Amino acid sequence: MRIDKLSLLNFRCFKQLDITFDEHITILVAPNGAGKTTVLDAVRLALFPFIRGFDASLYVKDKSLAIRTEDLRLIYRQEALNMEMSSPAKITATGEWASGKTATWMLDKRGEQPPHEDKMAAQLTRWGEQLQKRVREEHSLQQVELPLMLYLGTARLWYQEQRLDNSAFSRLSGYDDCLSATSNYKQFEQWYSWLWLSYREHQITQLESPSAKLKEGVRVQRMKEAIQAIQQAINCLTQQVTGWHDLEYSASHNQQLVMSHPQYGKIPLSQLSDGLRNAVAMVADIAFRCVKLNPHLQNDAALKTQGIVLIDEVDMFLHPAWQQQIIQSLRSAFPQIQFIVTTHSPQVLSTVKRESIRLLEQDENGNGKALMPLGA
Amino acid sequence: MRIDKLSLLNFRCFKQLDITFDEHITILVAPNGAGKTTVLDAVRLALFPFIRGFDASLYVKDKSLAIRTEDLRLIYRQEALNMEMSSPAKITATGEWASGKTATWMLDKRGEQPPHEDKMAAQLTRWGEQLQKRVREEHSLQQVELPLMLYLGTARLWYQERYRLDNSAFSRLSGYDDCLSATSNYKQFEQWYSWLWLSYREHQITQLESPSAKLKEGVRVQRMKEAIQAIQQAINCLTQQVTGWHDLEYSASHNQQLVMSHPQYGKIPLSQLSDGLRNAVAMVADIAFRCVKLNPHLQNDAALKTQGIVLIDEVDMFLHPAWQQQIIQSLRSAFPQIQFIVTTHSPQVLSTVKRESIRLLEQDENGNGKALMPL
Amino acid sequence: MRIDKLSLLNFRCFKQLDITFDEHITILVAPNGAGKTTVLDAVRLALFPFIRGFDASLYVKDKSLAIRTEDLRLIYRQEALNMEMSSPAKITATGEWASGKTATWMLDKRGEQPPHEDKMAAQLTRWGEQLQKRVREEHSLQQVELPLMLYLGTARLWYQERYERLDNSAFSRLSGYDDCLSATSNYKQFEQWYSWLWLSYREHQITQLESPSEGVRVQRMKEAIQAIQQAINCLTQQVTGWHDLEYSASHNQQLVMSHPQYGKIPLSQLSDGLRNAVAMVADIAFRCVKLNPHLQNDAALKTQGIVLIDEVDMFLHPAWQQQIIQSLRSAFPQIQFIVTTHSPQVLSTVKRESIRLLEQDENGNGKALMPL
Amino acid sequence: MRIDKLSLLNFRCFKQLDITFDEHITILVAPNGAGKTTVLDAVRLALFPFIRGFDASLYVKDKSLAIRTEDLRLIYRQEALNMEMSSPAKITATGEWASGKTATWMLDKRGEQPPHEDKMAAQLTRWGEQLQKRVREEHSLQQVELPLMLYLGTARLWYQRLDNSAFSRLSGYDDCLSATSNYKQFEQWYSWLWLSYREHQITQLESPEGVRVQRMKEAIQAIQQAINCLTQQVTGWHDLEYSASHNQQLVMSHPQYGKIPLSQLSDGLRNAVAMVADIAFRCVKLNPHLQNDAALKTQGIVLIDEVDMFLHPAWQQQIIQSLRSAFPQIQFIVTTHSPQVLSTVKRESIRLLEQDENGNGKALMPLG
Amino acid sequence: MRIDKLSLLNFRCFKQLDITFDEHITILVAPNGAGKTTVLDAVRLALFPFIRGFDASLYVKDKSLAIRTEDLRLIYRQEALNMEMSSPAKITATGEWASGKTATWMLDKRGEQPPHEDKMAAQLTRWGEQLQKRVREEHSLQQVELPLMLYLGTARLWYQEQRLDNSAFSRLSGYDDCLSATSNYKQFEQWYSWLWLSYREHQITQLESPSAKLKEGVRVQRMKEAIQAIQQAINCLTQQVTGWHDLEYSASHNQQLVMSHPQYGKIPLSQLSDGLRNAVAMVADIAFRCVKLNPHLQNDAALKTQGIVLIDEVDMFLHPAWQQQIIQSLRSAFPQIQFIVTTHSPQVLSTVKRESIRLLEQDENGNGKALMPLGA
């Protein structure tokens, strides 16, 4: 979808806040205190209505996706013995789903009562259910494109039957743990290893019975093109600056992924630099979701998929020459996704214009301002 | 807040009952199987709607706070050797909420259908919600006075061998936690009192270290000291004269326990004391700390300037007659602005009590009840 | 068994105390802070070894059955504003176990060292082991008579909404010693045993009615039910009106009582006094029935032992208070009672030879004396 | 203890490298793939034998404690399309172990054969065994000064008594090469220690034996001094405390703004405080026979990877000086890739890493 | 070891029992009741002192290898309301170990008290500890022969790293769950598959690269002889009556165990008859323990290992022609193992002498007698 602005009232550290988001790229910088995680959590809480209408609900018991009592402001006064909650907590998300309509959905919590949603949240989850039911039917000539809602946190490296063909499954499995705060690298390695081995098996079998090629070769073709897509995205980060390219799988290396370099050969990914692993994990996380969601594009799963992706500390483990080429490379790899990223490195801030910078300042009473730089 | 009259219809052992309360103290005197706990439960059920408007009532797990099928009167027909269930069971209560506002509200239950209430109970709930909103408001000029509601039944007893803070324990509304429930609330008092004492000692040590911070920093020390003295005075007023023990405090030497002092004896933990003193201290503390927590802007008159209704069942238990002759006066002197409704079956409590506070309960063969002043 | 004299040295509030008990009933009358629960705890600690000789004492989770450092006397030195712990704490008990056998046994604790006991304390454990061995024998011509020991403290109370498939050990005689000298409530055991009895009796009733003519077990069950019912009637009927305690399936499988004017009501819907009195009497009655099954009709009327009751007049109005001692003596004629109270109404019709006023001096010297 | 030179032959990425360390501080400044973690890992492996003689490393099964097959260099041919697995992996470390006790030790790995070392490594291991036996004596007037060895990597951010006993002394070397330092455990044990100290203070205050009191008091003093060295310069905050009055929280003091909670600070500063506090606590535990200058008078080697992790550029100009001043006897080896760290450091401690087209690495200093 | 007598007092259903065991084979027959399981459990409880001296028992902590309170005798009388518990319960076992050391140990329980043991039980545990410490050495030239204690129950078909070389491990791992009542066929198939794959890989790297023929032949010979011993033990039951023989591992059938028949070929084991599967499981369960315990024999791991084995319902799922050949084939497969087996069928009873049959009968009071038949 898309988001235009977000308003916060009586949240964790903000008494009130109004923030505006850019069309393509926006960067949040806060010199002191928290506040970046607060805004990212607010945006993450404003999109759970969509994913809830996709069989993802309290079965996993992910209690972090609803406003909690610990998320309400609690003021301490030195001259009094009591400590009173400030009620109610309110998130007002303004967005745009399909070109033409502007929506404004609100999520509020009052004290210890269960959280409450407005009519627009119900409308949004009904839209999610509508897309699910439209996908699940196969007796249609016109296919549909799903949006991508992904959240990447600072815990994305802590603890580092597969299918691809069009169906109700393998098109809704890309929403599994999309907004979770844990790592999801094992899933990528399993899926990629399965895809590579099955592609090798299919290309071996192709030489046996060419008669059914009209029904078989296309399979291989699909299982080829997808790979290319993924690889292309990864290259856009790892080749011009570092030199590594063409992520591959080979059982000859004790069945683990490898990467290629012009001069240092083919080396396992498990014993490379930290920044390369970070970039590979991020771009892989975006890409394999993009290719599972829209197998029907088969070459523009990364160049036509639309959605919203959240990143915390995008410049983690990278050197300045790399930090001067991360934003443009992310834009080139995925040109149709809106990004909300949080940084603090002065190098990254010099690769973007003044319209994509938001300085968050907080007063003593909690009032917050999301300003833009004065000079240019 | 005040309650003035009460009516019961087909509630337990009473086919019909009308009872009138006094402004300050009312004592119900009757033998076993007369209906005192019945009246106390009726008052609890009448007053619950006010508490239902607060966020502290969402954790109540007491099943006795709604009218039940076991509460419907059963009539024994001897010829058929049968018991017939009479319906409906109804409660009516007249009272005053704010200045110059009289009201009457009703509760009912028929058969096995869920209980029902009229509009006035909903208005109590809305009044409670309004007060809760007023308390939680920042930058308020006028002050807010919260009332006190408590029920001290037979589950308050401290028998042999019967016995960090959450962010909600520091709120005013925490004075309404388990207020009208049939449970024991000594652990909450213990935790809060220990926290006050630890904070006060921390400030004392800090002041003793550097004598250069006694400017705008000593307000919190003063507030805590005043809360401590209020609770201590309230507890002393019941025990000191007849028993000698006073000054309930917190001691780290005695394995971090609550201790009390005697002139002839020494200083002993509360859990090692007599049953009567132990129960009396628990009973008085249950009111004192709630009074301190609810209204923090009085700061030394929380016990002496709080209004509300407090219910006590079997007030003279574990106390010898010499102690029984002083309890009503001690409670009236400690908490002078609280309407007390108490029940007893001992002539010693009524030793020095006016005849305008005693209600004898009588019943006829058909179940018609009477609550009358003594002649 | 029987206890005749007791001595306390450096216990909680007594530097020294010597107390003599009566054969049948003895009442301790004193205000608060006088040492009645102190004497009851002393007697409980003295009597523990006999139970410690039984296999039913392995599941005891009570920390109050051993002398603790909190029981050592503390002397307040005013000049130094100090508390001094005086040692040692001793408990001496004189009594009789079997015919023509007088004994005296002592318990001690010094400092923070573990408590100690003498040889005469171990002989009680050995006698308990011997009795247990004689109860678990097949083809024994001689009968075995077991004594009853019970403690009914302040933890027995049935307050508002307390609401406290049998194991194979619940059918043994020795199960009469489960949590006997512990500060706990034992109402669930009585409820389960009584419900099982009533269900079995009804099963036999329908079985007999189906095919008119096995005949002995029905008689045993009927006799046990009659004994328990009579024991409760001896206290509840005359003053209040509720007599028969029965199991009812029509009332959602609950225990019910009946009244001449009112109807039939569950026990958990009655007054506090009724609940407490019924629990107190039943706790003795069903243990009497279980311990000695060979009497079969006089288990309550022919059982010997010691029963300790604290605050016997709780939740009872003066008219009921005037008759508790007589009711207990009429229900259980052969049991030695030691009870504590501070009400002048319980002593209304009691001989002066059963009253022990407790007093103490400024130095802690205690006296338990007859009135006048 | 001190390391003076490291030499590597046929390592992960270096065909031959010779680096000279400094007495106090050294920074390896290089972009990605230039071999900064490799140097730290080599130093870490060189120090394994000393720890190995403590009967505590046999429980954990970690493959990184010895050279593996993945360590051996691989050469690319570009014509045969094959990777040549070179051999042997060589590690040479020279230094001082005591007052005028110089030594030079070596670790080797040939092919798939298990790694083996010279008997000077056994000499170091038996020196460690001698130390652990000597400290275990229950009656000895002589004072033993144990050193500090710690490795804080990029995995550090994710998951009882202070008596003069052998268990307390040997608890310092627990997980000394796989240390973790986040905020949760730090606040937990700091709060426990402060609660015990406040209990003893209140006991003394109420009624006017001291063995366990002074230890806690001066451990508090040491930790407070270290954190103050970290924070009191740039900001006025100092004297981290646990306040039960202030909603039972860890609070800091500022002469103008009063008291502020520690939960209002950013994650980076909290993690830096936790790192400094953990190092100071290990220093206090290891050498109790000073009780207040343990952090200021203990020698050893501490290895930190990516010291500029999650730090605002304003706090990247004071980390090195703060670490130097809070521990003026420890030898530090840290790896950075940010110029803001180097804005106040002298030239002598900077070791830029270069590598030719073959793998002939160099560790040099800026020319000026 | 060996057992020559067993006495039971106040156990589950026997008030008093005295039973004598034969040197090689003994059969227990009971027309009614559950005495056979009682006697087998008594024998199983009298051998746990030996196994308790091995640390490998730490893997199992079931509360079933000690005398429970439910194992005592409860007396129900129809004329009384009380039900009492007969105490004490005693298991007296008379046996021989060390080939000449006669002993008589006793286990007892008194009511709810914890179980008690005599000096001889401690001696047996100490002898187990001595054997463990003597095995844990490696440089010693003289080799130790361990005994086997195995129990097979009726639940041995329900539930349906690796090393072999001489060491402290792989010689004590054969005692893992030796007296448990849960099936352990998975832990046999895993070990057998590992052994077969390793042997095949050694053979492949042998003939493919003759230069690596220096000293790897000894491992190949040891593994070959282990396979041969297991196969012969299984053949001694299967071949003569059913025709199947020479079980094999082959990945050509989806990595599954296979068996061979001259007139039907090679078939996966999971699809044969029930009786053949039962026999394979039993003989495998004996065999791989016999070969892991004593690799040093390396030719007669089955023909020279001594011990005691208990079988419940030995004739399960077998037809009458197979029930006249089970006892003799068990004896031939393992000639030096004492067997205590329980059965019903009259066909098995005709293949053994009159001196190896025990008939258990109970009186009304519980007194038990173990008679011998008069006829043939």
Ligand SMILES: Nc1ncnc2c1ncn2[C@@H]1O[C@H](COP(=O)(O)OP(=O)(O)OP(=O)(O)O)[C@@H](O)[C@H]1O
């Ligand atoms: N559902 C019912 N229908 C009719 N009578 C009932 C019912 N439930 C209880 N009763 C009777 O009503 C009386 C209840 O009296 P209650 O115990 O409340 O008063 P009390 O004697 O003053 O006791 P307390 O000490 O608890 O105040 C008892 O006689 C009881 O048997």
Ligand SMILES: Nc1ncnc2c1ncn2[C@@H]1O[C@H](COP(=O)(O)OP(=O)(O)OP(=O)(O)O)[C@@H](O)[C@H]1O
């Ligand atoms: N360890 C101790 N040292 C000194 N004095 C103690 C100690 N423990 C308790 N005391 C005091 O001695 C008193 C003993 O009286 P106790 O409460 O046992 O009897 P009682 O007043 O008759 O109570 P009850 O209602 O239980 O019969 C305690 O109330 C307390 O004041």
Ligand SMILES: Nc1ncnc2c1ncn2[C@@H]1O[C@H](COP(=O)(O)OP(=O)(O)OP(=O)(O)O)[C@@H](O)[C@H]1O
């Ligand atoms: N086994 C190996 N054989 C050959 N080259 C290797 C091997 N393992 C790693 N490398 C190469 O060595 C380099 C790894 O450098 P290193 O791991 O020291 O990282 P770094 O750039 O110093 O940063 P960081 O501290 O973040 O890890 C990469 O160029 C990698 O391709």
